[PDB]
């Protein structure tokens, strides 16, 4: 199949975006 090649690949940009925002919280939270 080819239709899943983009729909599943945009599905993880949804999933990737939290993680860089997530460690952004912990660069300051561990210092406090």
Partner 1 sequence: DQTLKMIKILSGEMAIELHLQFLIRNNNTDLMILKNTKDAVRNSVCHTATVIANSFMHCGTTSDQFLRDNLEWLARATNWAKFTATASLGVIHKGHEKEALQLMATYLPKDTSPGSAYQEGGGLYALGLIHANHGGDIIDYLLNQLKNASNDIVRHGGSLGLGLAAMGTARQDVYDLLKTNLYQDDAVTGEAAGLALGLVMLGSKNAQAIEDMVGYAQETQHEKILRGLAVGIALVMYGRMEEADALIESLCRDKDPILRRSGMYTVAMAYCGSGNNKAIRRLLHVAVSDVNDDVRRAAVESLGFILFRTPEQCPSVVSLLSESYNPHVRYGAAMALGICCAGTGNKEAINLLEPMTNDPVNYVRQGALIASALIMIQQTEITCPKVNQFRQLYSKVINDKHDDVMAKFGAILAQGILDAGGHNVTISLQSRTGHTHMPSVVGVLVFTQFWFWFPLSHFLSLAYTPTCVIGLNKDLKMPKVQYKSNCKPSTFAYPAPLEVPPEPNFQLLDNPARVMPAQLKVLTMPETCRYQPFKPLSIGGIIILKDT
Partner 2 sequence: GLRQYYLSKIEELQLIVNDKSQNLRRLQAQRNELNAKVRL
What is d(CA 2, CA 26) in angstroms, rounded to the nearest whole number? 39
Residue in 1, 4, 6, 14 binding partner 2, rule: CB under 8 A: 6
User: Per rule CB under 8 A, is residue 26 in the interface with partner 1?
Assistant: yes
Residue in 4, 18, 20, 27 binding partner 1, rule: CB under 8 A: 18
Q: Hunting for tokens 């599905």 — which residue is that?
A: 11
User: Per rule CB under 8 A, is residue 14 in the interface with partner 2?
Assistant: no
C-alpha angle 18-32-24 in degrees, rounded to nearest 5: 20
Residues in the site for partner 1, rule: CB under 8 A?
Answer: 11, 14-15, 17-19, 21-22, 25-26, 29-30
């Amino acid at each position: 199949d080819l239709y899943s090649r983009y729909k599943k690949l945009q599905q993880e940009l949804e999933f990737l975006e939290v993680q860089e925002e997530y460690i952004k919280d912990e660069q300051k939270n561990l210092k406090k």
